[PDB]
Design an enzyme around this catalytic site. Sequence first.
Site, PDB file in Angstrom:
ATOM      1  N   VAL A  27       0.868  -1.191   0.019  1.00 17.27           N
ATOM      2  CA  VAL A  27      -0.009   0.062   0.195  1.00 17.27           C
ATOM      3  C   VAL A  27       0.712   1.405   0.016  1.00 17.27           C
ATOM      4  O   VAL A  27       0.351   2.423  -0.038  1.00 17.27           O
ATOM      5  CB  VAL A  27      -0.799  -0.038   1.219  1.00 17.27           C
ATOM      6  N   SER A  32       8.511   0.298   3.565  1.00 12.20           N
ATOM      7  CA  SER A  32       7.559  -0.240   2.908  1.00 12.20           C
ATOM      8  C   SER A  32       6.386  -0.562   3.886  1.00 12.20           C
ATOM      9  O   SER A  32       6.840  -0.880   4.916  1.00 12.20           O
ATOM     10  CB  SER A  32       7.990  -1.479   2.071  1.00 12.20           C
ATOM     11  N   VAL A  33       5.147  -0.358   3.250  1.00 21.38           N
ATOM     12  CA  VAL A  33       3.970  -0.814   3.875  1.00 21.38           C
ATOM     13  C   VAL A  33       3.018  -1.705   3.388  1.00 21.38           C
ATOM     14  O   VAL A  33       2.893  -1.643   2.070  1.00 21.38           O
ATOM     15  CB  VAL A  33       3.357   0.470   4.566  1.00 21.38           C
ATOM     16  N   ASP A 163       1.849   9.891  12.995  1.00 21.51           N
ATOM     17  CA  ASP A 163       2.871  10.484  12.336  1.00 21.51           C
ATOM     18  C   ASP A 163       3.684  11.332  12.878  1.00 21.51           C
ATOM     19  O   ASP A 163       3.757  12.666  12.547  1.00 21.51           O
ATOM     20  CB  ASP A 163       2.627  10.800  10.904  1.00 21.51           C
TER      21      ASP A 163
END
Length: 346
Positions: A27, A32-33, A163
Amino acid sequence: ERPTFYRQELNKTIWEVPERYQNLSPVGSYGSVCAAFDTKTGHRVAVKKLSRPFQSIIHAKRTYRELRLLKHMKHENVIGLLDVFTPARSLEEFNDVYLVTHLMGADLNNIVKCQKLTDDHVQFLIYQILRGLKYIHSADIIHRDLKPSNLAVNEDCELKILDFGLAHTDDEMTGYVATRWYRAPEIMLNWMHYNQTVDIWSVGCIMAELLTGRTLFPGTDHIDQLKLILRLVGTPGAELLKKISSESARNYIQSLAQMPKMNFANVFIGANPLAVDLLEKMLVLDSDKRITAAQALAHAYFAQYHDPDDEPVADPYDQSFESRDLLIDEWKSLTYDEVISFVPPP
Ligand SMILES: Nc1ccc(N2C(=O)C=CC2=O)cc1
Ligand SMILES: [Cl-]
Ligand SMILES: [Cl-]
Ligand SMILES: [Cl-]
Ligand SMILES: [Cl-]
Ligand SMILES: [Cl-]
Ligand SMILES: [Cl-]
Ligand SMILES: [Cl-]
Ligand SMILES: [Mg+2]
């Protein structure tokens, strides 16, 4: 005790994760996710694989900082840590770190640009931001990057802060960019040492945008943005000028023709008078004089949601590591200890 891991290559990246995480789907790509289904808890989750977490002293310390912060945050209006894992069986082979959080959908950007917000919606959204900030600030943590894309919201208008600022590049803050539009002027221009009051400035900018549908200070560069700010709140007096450390910055401010603070009722036309009053208390140029999160929760604008018995503070948070000088492998071993000591939430 150790779960069984399985390996797979997805979008040119190797993912090795416990069997509980199923149906991985990329995604985005810090790291990286992937989205996944967690069969142990029934939640849809985000799994982030950190990229080169220990490539330098600076990067290793940032990895440790992020893991310490996420392990500490336990509050309904703040992102928390569901899991952290590594496929390594020992410190000697430790190289990769994976972080697991609740999968977030819409952010406040989508709500603001699309929907029609009643005053009741503004009350509830800003209340939840301030409730999370009271918690965050009670641990002497500063978020530093509050903006609509860092606020997750669901269909029931429930909100989470995410975040955290782990310390942005100069290029990222240049020009006509939303990354700078919510920043307090003293940090945008490095006027002075900043503290938690910078986050209240950001809340004021966000609240204004929910009420009007428009960015409050959409500057085309740092100086254009300062001019928009000073036209609304007024140029500084001698009291604040004394607190600005740079002689050049002081000199620049005095080069500007003086301007009074504007009438906020004639800016935020038709807004709830209690909303106007609260905005005047957040958007104060001198950070020493801004309202705090704890004080704002008791403001009459939030009377229908305020409950002083359900606005918790945080456990104490030890940040002494920030002044410590360590080698890469020392930061790496500290991070390894925090991975293997993680205890999941109930
Ligand atoms: N430009 C602008 C747009 C909207 C507003 N406004 C509020 O601030 C509260 C209701 C309302 O329509 C004000 C200025
Ligand atoms: Cl498992
Ligand atoms: Cl969470
Ligand atoms: Cl590893
Ligand atoms: Cl944003
Ligand atoms: Cl003047
Ligand atoms: Cl601690
Ligand atoms: Cl080193
Ligand atoms: Mg973000």
